[PDB]
Amino acid sequence: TVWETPIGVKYTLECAKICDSDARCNRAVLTNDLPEGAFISTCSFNETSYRVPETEYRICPDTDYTGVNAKVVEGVTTIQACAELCSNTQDCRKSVFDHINNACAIKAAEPATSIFWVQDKQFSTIRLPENIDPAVKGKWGDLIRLPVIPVAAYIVPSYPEPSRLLFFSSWSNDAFSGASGMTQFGDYDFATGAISQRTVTNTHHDMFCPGISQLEDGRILIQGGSDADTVSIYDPATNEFTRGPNMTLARGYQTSCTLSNGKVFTIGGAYSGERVGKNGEVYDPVANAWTYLPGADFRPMLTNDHEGIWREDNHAWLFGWKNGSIFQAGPSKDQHWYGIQGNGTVAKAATRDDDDAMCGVWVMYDAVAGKIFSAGGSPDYTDSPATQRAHITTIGEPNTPAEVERVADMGFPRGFANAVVLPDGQVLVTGGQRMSLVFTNTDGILVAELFNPETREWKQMAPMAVPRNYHSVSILLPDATVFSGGGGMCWVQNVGDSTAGCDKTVDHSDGEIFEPPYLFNEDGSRAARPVISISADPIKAGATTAALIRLGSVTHSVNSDQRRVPLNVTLPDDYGILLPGYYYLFVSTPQGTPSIAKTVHVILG
Ligand SMILES: *[C@@H]1O[C@H](CO)[C@@H](O)[C@H](O)[C@H]1NC(C)=O
Ligand SMILES: [Cu+2]
């Protein structure tokens, strides 16, 4: 028995309307689709327009705008009077009416401040609706609710294009501890909009805080984390998980990268296992064996962190390059080549910056010219003002110097931001916060920014709805849209222990999808997209505008699997440019408009 008020609110019919009249009433003697506190991208209820005496504003009932106020005024008794007050306040785009206390808040200016939109019966929100030109600024869809906070996500490789996204958290949907023989997992078909969860127990792996690398045959190698030694192998073709060999050394928060030769190198990972610097190691899918590399020395890639060595070897910016090489772009001030020959190899390649940029974003946007984009991050893991500084790092031959040029500063300092390269080799940076503060919404940037490497300039994109900071993700989707999601998670001392004491306002068990400008004509209508009608055949390197993009895996601001291979409309010879593994074929009109990718499985000589 569910009484649904006209405006759309819903109780679980005489005291009921008594309760709907008192903004302070949850119980009587309230059960909306979303819980109270939930963040929203769109009004969950029937809105109302409203015109001022001199001639407009949209009103969403039972909702709040959180963030700094320009003004709070105690006089006001009515939404209409709060609305009036906004019109008379210079630069007022958003205002809040507090039913309980007869108060009107004018929200401070976006994007200088960030403002969020929450379900809350105590309030009503008023807004001068932004006219957003999708041709200049793209468009965000509405929050997608998910069973599991997507702390880690990867595209499941399929034919003729992928349809699914796995994501995972820890032993719980919204909480982590230490080791626990289990991970909570979520499966989102973005063709059907279908969503399922599952507990993965068979690999005895809590995969929270892991390394992630897609192998040659498109299996995903999930390494360490809460079960610091345990390795899990995800088989797209059976959607089942297999136990890989224990790493030589227990790690968490380390990065891994697939190499030229379909081996996987990892270095660092002082978060879990022993709390000391971790030297390199390399997985051979063929031997099905890990090999400790004592000469792949952690010490040169250490950041200097206020929290010490726990953090310093974390989230290295690793790329497989030519002839089994590894480039380390950061986050440490200085960059380094690493090799797996003999027992190791490490050498300085360049100085990128005069400060470390922990969890800064990083992407190889042009493999064929070894161009790497980097921006944001913070000198320390947490309690650290993020940087606006960005760089193109140019890499020629493995183990010779590399070229770093400071390009223009981002519009916003970002810690814990996420990045994807797009078919045109533009980079989309989403989320992150002014000051790295683990488990916070604080000063989450909502405006996406698109860096043009051809121009070396930034454009501000339309704003998303939720802050995407610690434990968030971004990842390219086959239809050339960006998925942005997660945030939060709560530490509890033991597995099973109650989550009741956790602040869930920082938990964002959901995502949202960006349609970049390139999907829109000058009139805001969706551009006509090139279609493709390709052999589903393992093609090898060097065999015969367009671009390939390797399927992404992503956690903790680390996307080690994504790589843009620009083409001649004809694959390149070098596997250290064309890393083997599953890609996206993007054919795009010479105005800039791309296809729904066709999946292309590159294999080794
Ligand atoms: C494509 O051809 C151009 C000249 O035709 C060449 O310089 C370039 O290296 C080739 N591929 C890419 C992606 O640049
Ligand atoms: Cu974490």
564: CATH: 2.60.40.10
Q: Closest ligand to 548 CA?
A: 1
Amino acid (1-letter code) at residue 549: I
Residue 505 and residue 553 share a domain:
no
Centroid of ligand 2 to alpha carbon of 231 (angstroms):
18
The bound ligand whose nearest atom lies closest to the alpha carbon of 564 is 1
Residue 89 lies in a domain: no
Residue 334 lies in a domain: yes
Instruction: Determine contact, residues 47/7, Cβ cutoff 8 Å.
Output: no
The tokens of 593 are what? 């408009």
Q: Three-class SS string for 21-57? A: HCCCCCCCCCCCCCCCCCECCCCCCCCEEECCCCCCE
127 occurs within a structural domain: no
Distance 568 CA to ligand 1 centre (A): 6
Contact partners, residue 407, CB within 8 Å, separation at least 6: 390, 391, 392, 451, 456
- Residue type, position 546, single letter: A
- Rounded Cα distance between 273 and 229, Å, is 7
User: What's the number of domains the chain is made of?
Assistant: 2
Mutate to test the pocket of ligand 1, among 368, 421, 424, 565 (most ligand atoms within 8 A of CB): 368
Using the 3D structure, point to which of 461, 491, 519 is the last residue of a domain. 519
Q: Which residues contact 411 (CB under 8 A, 6 or more apart)?
A: 111, 388, 447, 449, 458, 460
Residue 275 lies in a domain: yes
Tell me which method was used to determine the 3D structure.
X-ray
Whether residues 239 and 378 share a domain: the answer is yes
User: Which residue has the least CA distance to atom 4 on ligand 1?
Assistant: 568
| Residues 230, 243: Cα–Cα separation, whole Å | 8
Same domain as 552, residue 487 = no
Atom of ligand 1 nearest to the CA of 572: 11
> What is the Cα 404 distance to its own chain's centre?
25
Together in a domain, 598 and 484: no
Q: 583 an active-site residue?
A: no
Range of the domain at 553: 539-603
CA of 226 to the centre of ligand 2 (A): 10
- Which atom of ligand 1 is closest in space to residue 366's alpha carbon? 13
Residue 540: burial class (beta carbons within 10 Å; 0-12, 13-18, 19+): middle
User: Which listed ligand is nearest to 558 at the C-alpha?
Assistant: 2
Q: Are residues 210 and 324 in the same domain?
A: yes
Strand order in the sheet with 240-244: 211-214, 220-223, 231-235, 240-244
Question: Can you tell me which atom of ligand 1 is nearest the CA of 568?
Answer: 1
Atom 5 of ligand 1, residue of closest alpha carbon: 568
Do 337 and 295 share a structural domain? yes
Identify whether 557 is part of a domain.
Answer: yes
Query: Cβ < 6 Å from ligand 1: which residues?
Result: 368, 566-568
Q: Which residues contact 564 (CB under 8 A, 6 or more apart)?
A: 363, 364, 365, 366, 367, 421, 423, 425, 547, 548, 549
Contact 69, 82 (CB under 8 A): no
Phi and psi at residue 480, to the nearest 5°: 75, 15
**Cα(492) to centroid(ligand 2), Å:** 13
d(CA 478, CA 542): 24
Same domain, 598 and 458: no
Instruction: Give the chain's length.
Output: 605
Burial 234-266 (b: 16+ CB within 10 A, else e): bebeeeebeebeebbbbbbbbbbbbbbbbbbbb
Q: Which long-range contacts (CB under 8 A, 24 or more apart) does 443-446 make?
A: 443/114, 444/114, 444/116, 444/468, 444/469, 445/111, 445/114, 445/412, 445/414, 445/417, 446/110, 446/111, 446/114
450 domain residue, yes or no: yes
Where does 99-157 show beta strands of DSSP type E?
103-107, 116-127, 139-140, 144-145, 152-156
Count other Cβ atoms within 10 Å, centred on residue 1: 5
569 in the same domain as 437: no
116 within some domain: no
- Order of strands, edge to edge, in the sheet holding 447-452? 415-421, 427-433, 447-452, 457-463
What is the C-alpha separation between 302 and 316, in angstroms, rounded?
9
Same structural domain for residues 509 and 564? Answer: no
Give the pairing of strands 175-176 and 490-491: parallel
CATH code for the domain in which residue 498 is found? 2.130.10.80
Mutate which of 394, 568, 570 for ligand 1? The one with the most ligand atoms within 8 Å of its CB, which is 568
Query: Do residues 488 and 545 both lie within one domain?
Result: no
CA–CA separation, 388 vs 193, rounded Å?
36
Annotated binding site for Cu(2+): 253, 470-471, 556
Q: Say if residues 467 and 418 touch (Cβ distance below 8 Å).
A: no
487 three-state secondary structure: coil
Contact 159, 134 (CB under 8 A): no
Instruction: Identify the residue whose tokens are 């270095």.
Output: 267
Which residues does residue 145 pair with via DSSP β-bridges, in sequence order? 510
Separation of alpha carbons 36 and 400, rounded Å? 57
Joined together, the tokens standing for residue 179 give: 């080791």
CA of 53 to the centre of ligand 1 (A): 63
Alpha carbon distance 3, 109 (integer Å): 38
Nearest atom in ligand 1 to 369's CA:
14
Structure-token match 């001649």, residue found = 568
469 vs 434: CA distance, rounded Å: 10
For the chain, the straight-line distance linking the first and the last C-alpha, in angstroms and rounded, comes to 65
Gap sites in the chain (C to N > 2.5 Å), preceding residue numbers:
12, 29, 55, 533, 544, 569
Residue 241 lies in a domain: yes
Tokens at residue 187, please?
């499966």
Please pick, among 271, 283, 470, 582, the residue that the annotation labels catalytic: 470
Q: Are 356 and 379 in contact (CB under 8 A)?
A: yes
User: Are residues 428 and 504 located together in one domain of the fold?
Assistant: yes
Looking at the structure, tell me whether residues 514 and 564 fall in a common domain.
no
